[PDB]
Design a protein around this nucleic acid. Structure first.
Ligand SMILES: Nc1ncnc2c1ncn2[C@@H]1O[C@@H]2COP(=O)(O)O[C@H]2[C@H]1O
Ligand SMILES: Nc1ncnc2c1ncn2[C@@H]1O[C@@H]2COP(=O)(O)O[C@H]2[C@H]1O
Ligand SMILES: Nc1ncnc2c1ncn2[C@@H]1O[C@@H]2COP(=O)(O)O[C@H]2[C@H]1O
Ligand SMILES: Nc1ncnc2c1ncn2[C@@H]1O[C@@H]2COP(=O)(O)O[C@H]2[C@H]1O
Lengths: 74, 203, 203, 74, 73, 73
DNA sequence: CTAGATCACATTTTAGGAAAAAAG
DNA sequence: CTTTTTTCCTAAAATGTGAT
DNA sequence: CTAGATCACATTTTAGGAAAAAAG
DNA sequence: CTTTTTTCCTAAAATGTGAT
């Protein structure tokens, strides 16, 4: 498993724009996020190139990325 | 944080290359070494008739024009063209050699990348000698899903590339790459609509 | 006299390889670097069916098995087989790295050779993508007249090689190499009798 | 031109075996030698692999080789 | 069908999509499923992303576009 | 022809070649040019290098092997 | 024997930038 | 207000076609 | 359209080492 | 005398063949 994947998405300190999209897509934990795919996220309303890029960049600075493949979830 | 690369860059001239511009012309004199700070380029070679063939894509982090640095008066061995827009660190061979004699680590990092390219290019040779076009294309779709700019996608990795280009990678006609992309779709191996291709089963 | 190479060799284990023996098996772990003191080897790769393809000949002076030296836990990327009988200097990667930190010149010499191989191999790619079999063979006869063991001959350079082998170099069947060697003879470009071939107009 | 190519073949200090073959093939000057081709020399009587090799090796230690292509000769 | 008579709002669309339908006179989900894809794209302020959101919210609820209905209203 | 009547010695061969001819009863150059290549190779102590020396010393003098002569001797 | 290349042009698909709509 | 998303547009590039 | 691959086997050609002949 | 060249030998490897 991993310890960071269970913290809320807020521990990433995103912008208001990004934060509001995740919370309206039911993404509460960082573990839910890393499982979501890039193409999948772009379809979510109010999330465009700059927000998508901010997310891939805040995850990268913390070892993680998108489209990660997890087991035993939740 | 990376001490060596930071030090290296601080001795370079940084220069922006617009998308689709040529950084290196095959045949020209080789006296400068490049390092891709941001962007991506395509390393290509040509036959007499002018037909193109994509040797390799290089990305952020990769050195370019390193091959002329070991023997005097060598000529650029291939065209290098900016795929996207690039920001490139530049340093003269002469002055780069001086860095090496201050800290050989930078030379290690350069040689690491050379070794890799030799392994990758050698494989390309095997692919051309051993695989039919379907095999080389299938292989190339897998290698393109490895690149940085490839997007993660539920069914597998999603990529943006033209049929014409794939043709220049695996060395065949664009008409043929089209036919085969259509077959690999019946065989439910990929999803192709436009420049957008989802390579099933990566990730 | 050559100070650096002499120093390098004095830290190596020298080992004799009989003709036709394998120095390196593709897939094996890479932990040792080789240097050809005497002899010549063939660097080759294989497809699943077992078909062979000669990536390159290396001769006295050339390093072998250098590609595993930059990343940890890499695997030999190709078979290396003694063409003639070879005497080979050997040194563990671990201990070679220690030499580098004493005198980076040796690393320069290794990287020089890598750069060359990349240029040569890249060209092989172009040859496969651009030339028909006659073109690749003609090209290969010219490149074989460049080798050390090629004998000077009045009409042009004389070489010893089999049709089967040429086939494994340019990537085609041996029957075909035979037909073409017979055509290049009507066109008075070469003289072929046995393994002995005179490549007209070199030298 | 070159200065060494006009000295007699003797300045190479060959073996008796090699020396006797050249002098019966009319090769007096080092300039005549470097012009001769390897395949051509091997046919000359009493000259085999070891002598041919000694010659290619004594020339190599002195910059030269066989099958060299010269102008203005003599 | 029961769902085809509920207002379009029961789909919970974005403000952008909601405003386009209400200016095109599409009040009931039944009116929507009858509209064709090519037809919708012409409607002002509705582009690839909104059109895609609509086809995706209908798909998650069994329905789709260009459906062929009888007895309407 | 005038040259075909001179002894084989006028060719200045090697000791090895000279000794093979004289033990095969080839005294005159005319006897030689009549002999065939395959035939000569069978003669003891005569191998590729000697056979080649002979074909090369005859060629430099217009002649060759397997020549077909009349009125001999 | 078969895999691929080949031909020109009507049609499809893309790049990317101004401008409008919506969110912050 | 400002910034980001999303629409909406066309020259130009990319594409399929299928018998030999 | 064409360049090449393909098939098995009778025939050709080679490697290389003992031994003989000749030169040193 | 010794050393180098040259002969001379056969298992095994290399080769051509040519219509589809
Ligand atoms: N096979 C290859 N793979 C990756 N990069 C290459 C290859 N061949 C050439 N290049 C790059 O293209 C450059 C052309 O200029 P240089 O010869 O100076 O250096 C060359 C390499 O940096
Ligand atoms: N394209 C090539 N040209 C020359 N040598 C090569 C090539 N590819 C591999 N090699 C050599 O074969 C070796 C196989 O083992 P290594 O990967 O350690 O190092 C490799 C190189 O030394
Ligand atoms: N390339 C072509 N040119 C002309 N006619 C064609 C082509 N392809 C199909 N047809 C009918
Ligand atoms: N490879 C072959 N097999 C059988 N017969 C053949 C072949 N080549 C020519 N003929 C007649």
């Amino acid at each position: 498993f991993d310890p960071i994947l269970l913290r809320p998405v807020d521990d990433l300190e995103l912008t208001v724009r990004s934060a509001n999209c995740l919370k309206a897509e039911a993404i509460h934990y960082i573990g839910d996020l890393v499982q979501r795919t890039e193409v999948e996220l772009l379809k979510t309303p109010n999330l465009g190139k700059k927000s998508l890029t901010e997310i891939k960049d805040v995850l990268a600075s913390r070892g993680l990325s998108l489209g990660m493949r997890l087991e035993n979830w939740p | 944080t990376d001490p060596t690369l930071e030090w290296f860059l601080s001795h370079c001239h940084i220069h922006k290359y617009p998308s689709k511009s040529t950084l290196i012309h095959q045949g020209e004199k080789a006296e400068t070494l490049y390092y891709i700070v941001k962007g991506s380029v395509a390393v290509l070679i040509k036959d007499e008739e002018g037909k193109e063939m994509i040797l390799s894509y290089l990305n952020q982090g990769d050195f370019i024009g390193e091959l002329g640095l070991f023997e005097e008066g060598q000529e650029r061995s291939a065209w290098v063209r900016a795929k996207t827009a690039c920001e490139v660190a530049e340093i003269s061979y002469k002055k780069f050699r001086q860095l090496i004699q201050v800290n050989p680590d930078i030379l290690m990092r350069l040689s690491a990348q050379m070794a890799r390219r030799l392994q990758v290019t050698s494989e390309k040779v095997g692919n051309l000698a051993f695989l039919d076009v379907t095999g080389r294309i299938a292989q190339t779709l897998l290698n393109l899903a490895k690149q940085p700019d490839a997007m993660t996608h539920p069914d597998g990795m999603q990529i943006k590339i033209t049929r014409q280009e794939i043709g220049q990678i695996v060395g065949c006609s664009r008409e043929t790459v089209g036919r085969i992309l259509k077959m690999l779709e019946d065989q439910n191996l990929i999803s192709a609509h436009g420049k957008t291709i989802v390579v099933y089963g990566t990730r």
